[PDB]
Design a protein around this ligand. Structure first.
Ligand code: HEM
Length: 162
């Protein structure tokens, strides 16, 4: 209901409640391929930023899996974007980059974790968000871990439900 702060207009295409369709696709050189369901809620309350919650679930049992939440800020009147996330693995990250048209490309510069986080530890993350020609939201996530160089981990497209 609050009018949207002009600072976040360059990312207005991300706003909504979204559901992975088809299921998200998970991979890594060390992992068997997997699928997952994900609910994405991207919202705002009038501040110069977006609020997000991304919650994934097992496609069959619907048991909760990865979860994260945070904020997406922009430098006013620019296309420069900064993303902060806390993840249920006990990991936090700061990613920055830019939006051009309806594509956002960001990369981590800072990652920290809890002392008992499960190994292997992630060292670098990059994400690409885009709105495709059908009006669906796409996210692709890549990462490097202590033992694996930068490569794709996740790809998902979402249907807006709300
Ligand atoms: C930016 C967000 C994420 C990061 C940084 C991240 C990081 C990682 C890392 C470091 C690993 C271990 C890699 C290895 O075993 O070599 C992993 C594994 C895994 N992740 Fe992700 N992850 C993310 C998002 C997700 C999401 C959304 C899902 C959806 C369910 C997911 C599901 C899994 C699964 C199933 C595994 C392997 C579990 C196993 O070892 O059996 N992750 N992730």
């Amino acid at each position: 209901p609050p009018k949207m702060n002009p600072v976040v207009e360059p990312l207005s295409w991300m706003l909504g409640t979204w559901l992975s369709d088809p299921p998200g696709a998970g991979t890594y050189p060390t992992l068997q391929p997997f699928q997952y369901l994900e609910e994405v809620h991207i919202s705002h309350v009038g501040q110069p930023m977006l609020n997000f919650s991304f919650n994934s679930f097992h496609p069959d049992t619907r048991k909760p899996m990865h979860r994260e939440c945070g904020f997406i800020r922009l430098k006013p009147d620019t296309n420069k974007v900064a993303f902060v996330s806390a993840q249920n693995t006990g990991v936090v990250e700061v990613e920055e980059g830019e939006v051009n048209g309806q594509e956002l490309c960001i990369a981590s510069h800072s990652i920290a974790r809890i002392s008992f986080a499960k190994e292997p530890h992630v060292e670098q993350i990059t994400r690409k968000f885009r709105l495709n020609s059908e009006g669906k939201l796409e996210q692709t996530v890549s990462m490097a871990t202590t033992t694996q160089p930068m490569t794709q981990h996740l790809h998902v497209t979402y249907k807006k439900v709300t």
